[PDB]
Amino acid sequence: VLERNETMYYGGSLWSPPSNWNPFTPWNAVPGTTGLVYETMFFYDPLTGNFDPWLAEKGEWLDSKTYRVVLREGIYWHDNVPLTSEDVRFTFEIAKKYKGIHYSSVWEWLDHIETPDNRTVIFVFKDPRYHEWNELLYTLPIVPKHIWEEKDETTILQSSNEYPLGSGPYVAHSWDQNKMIFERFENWWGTKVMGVKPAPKYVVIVRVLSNNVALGMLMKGELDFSNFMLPGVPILKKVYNLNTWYDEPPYHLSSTVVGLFLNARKYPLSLPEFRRAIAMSINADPIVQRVYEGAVLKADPLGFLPNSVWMKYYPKEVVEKHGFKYDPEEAKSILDKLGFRDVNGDGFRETPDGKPIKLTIECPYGWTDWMQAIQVIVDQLKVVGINAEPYFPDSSKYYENMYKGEFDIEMNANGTGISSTPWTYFNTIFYPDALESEFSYTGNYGRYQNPEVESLLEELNRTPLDNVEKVTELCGKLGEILLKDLPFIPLWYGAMAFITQDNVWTNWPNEHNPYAWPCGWANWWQTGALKILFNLKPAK
Ligand SMILES: OC[C@H]1O[C@@H](O[C@H]2[C@H](O)[C@H](O)[C@H](O)O[C@@H]2CO)[C@@H](O)[C@@H](O)[C@@H]1O
Numbered sequence: 181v182l183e184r185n186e187t188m189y190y191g192g193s194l195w196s197p198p199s200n201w202n203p204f205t206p207w208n209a210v211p212g213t214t215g216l217v218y219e220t221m222f223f224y225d226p227l228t229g230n231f232d233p234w235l236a237e238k239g240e241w242l243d244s245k246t247y248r249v250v251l252r253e254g255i256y257w258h259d260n261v262p263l264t265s266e267d268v269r270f271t272f273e274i275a276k277k278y279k280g281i282h283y284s285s286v287w288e289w290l291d292h293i294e295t296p297d298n299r300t301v302i303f304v305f306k307d308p309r310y311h312e313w314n315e316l317l318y319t320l321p322i323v324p325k326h327i328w329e330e331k332d333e334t335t336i337l338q339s340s341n342e343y344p345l346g347s348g349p350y351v352a353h354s355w356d357q358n359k360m361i362f363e364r365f366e367n368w369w370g371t372k373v374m375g376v377k378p379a380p381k382y383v384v385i386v387r388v389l390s391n392n393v394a395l396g397m398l399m400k401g402e403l404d405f406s407n408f409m410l411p412g413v414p415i416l417k418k419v420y421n422l423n424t425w426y427d428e429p430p431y432h433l434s435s436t437v438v439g440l441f442l443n444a445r446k447y448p449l450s451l452p453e454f455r456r457a458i459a460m461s462i463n464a465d466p467i468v469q470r471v472y473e474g475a476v477l478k479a480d481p482l483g484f485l486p487n488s489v490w491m492k493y494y495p496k497e498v499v500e501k502h503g504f505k506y507d508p509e510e511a512k513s514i515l516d517k518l519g520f521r522d523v524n525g526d527g528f529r530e531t532p533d534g535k536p537i538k539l540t541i542e543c544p545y546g547w548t549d550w551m552q553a554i555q556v557i558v559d560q561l562k563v564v565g566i567n568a569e570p571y572f573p574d575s576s577k578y579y580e581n582m583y584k585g586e587f588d589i590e591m592n593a594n595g596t597g598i599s600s601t602p603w604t605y606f607n608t609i610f611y612p613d614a615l616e617s618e619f620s621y622t623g624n625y626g627r628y629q630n631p632e633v634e635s636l637l638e639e640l641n642r643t644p645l646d647n648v649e650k651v652t653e654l655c656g657k658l659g660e661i662l663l664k665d666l667p668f669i670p671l672w673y674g675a676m677a678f679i680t681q682d683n684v685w686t687n688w689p690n691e692h693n694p695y696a697w698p699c700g701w702a703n704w705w706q707t708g709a710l711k712i713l714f715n716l717k718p719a720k
């Protein structure tokens with residue numbers, strides 16, 4: 181048992197038993213592992229676009245093909261071993277040695293690494309991919325060479341890495357089937373050097389069966405920092421004194437593009453024309469209005485986050501020319517012409533060869549808002565004669581399905597999160613290497629194939645972010661393919677659900693004090709949620 185006034189209870193991102201703390205497997209690692217235990221070279225702030233120096237004291241392009249990091253002086257692993265340039269070197273090079281490591285692809289465009297001293301890392305690139313490099317700067321955890329040095333590729337990839345040895349503000353304390361506990365590392369270098377200190381001695385990641393459970397926890401003050409979707413926000417504020425980012429609708433920040441991935445390898449979902457018909461049959465308005473009660477924004481056919489820097493590169497003409505809209509009569513007309521007609525009289529269209537068509541549509545059990553949205557979609561598909569069958573597997577199975585591509589229709593917001601570049605969005609959708617992967621963690625979960633996109637993705641990647649004209653043109657070419665072939669159908673912008681209660685901790689950020697992004701998802705703590713810990717104050 182932990183002293184309540186020195187413990188902060190977080191929930192919203194833990195939907196399976198804690199069973200993995202491996203920095204090399206970010207898809208399985210318990211939320212907080214990267215961020216609270218492992219650190220990155222930079223923080224990234226979605227509120228501003230700022231890269232704030234963490235392990236790195238500075239980072240600079242020296243010329244077009246050479247990037248230099250200079251580490252802060254006085255960084256230490258938790259076992260008092262100095263964290264140096266060779267740890268950063270190792271973090272990259274281990275992935276050239278063991279190609280199974282998820283970022284081994286970096287060595288296709290990174291040539292080599294130099295370390296002139298204990299603080300300096302120089303990356304020389306053969307093909308500098310600026311967009312993806314910017315993202316690595318705040319997402320790639322730095323790992324201890326002295327710990328991983330002697331491990332083979334199988335250990336690295338399969339180890340659960342209990343009690344991770346990192347450099348961050350917390351260590352793993354304890355866990356069970358329904359919670360992860362972190363304990364603050366008092367001798368953290370970060371406090372000595374940066375002068376910041378996380379206020380809670382204990383951070384507990386709470387696992388819960390369903391969003392509905394979270395509400396009770398919040399009302400009784402058993403949850404402090406909630407990323408769970410919950411309905412009736414005005415009533416939550418007025419009656420139960422629960423707070424959100426904005427005083428007024430939409431109440432929450434937007435964090436993701438929520439849409440449907442389709443199995444592009446399964447007939448008839450393999451037909452671009454059929455996929456278009458699905459897209460034209462779905463009206464997100466009732467989802468936005470009724471499921472979320474206006475706490476989210478509807479997406480246009482391209483699906484660029486309106487609050488993101490992707491809008492800097494918005495291919496306006498392309499969307500107006502090639503985008504789809506809700507148009508069920510035209511959806512029926514398309515299906516007719518393709519020969520998808522009802523021959524047995526059950527209201528559902530069969531294949532041109534008279535074969536029945538039934539498509540599973542899925543999201544995790546307990547994600548109440550997506551379960552409702554899915555039935556809205558089922559009901560909408562019903563009236564154009566498409567038989568969609570709702571399926572709500574455990575989260576663990578939902579993700580296994582996603583990674584293996586074992587689904588028909590899948591509601592998805594994995595990898596479509598706000599970022600420093602629209603490249604992350606197009607990469608998540610088109611991820612060409614999914615086609616050669618049993619497990620695709622990165623994207624293109626339905627295994628869509630296209631001979632142009634890989635070249636287009638690379639060309640975008642290697643274009644300096646300040647060449648607005650060229651980045652925009654490439655977003656247009658990529659967007660054009662997206663809108664024409666619809667491997668992913670954008671539907672709305674996911675709410676960054678963030679609800680707090682002040683009986684134990686105060687000084688949360690909100691629209692009047694907008695100092696940090698409030699996201700406790702795995703691999704997002706370095707975008708603001710850790711910073712929130714630096715700023716929390718005990719309640720009086
Ligand atoms: O809104 C659906 C559920 O989202 C959950 O947060 C997700 C987020 O949508 C996204 O999928 C990201 O990759 O993982 C997050 C953490 O699991 C929860 O907010 C849940 O309460 C919502 O029902």
Ligand SMILES: [Mg+2]
Nearest residue numbers: 522524526528
């Ligand atoms: Mg029929």
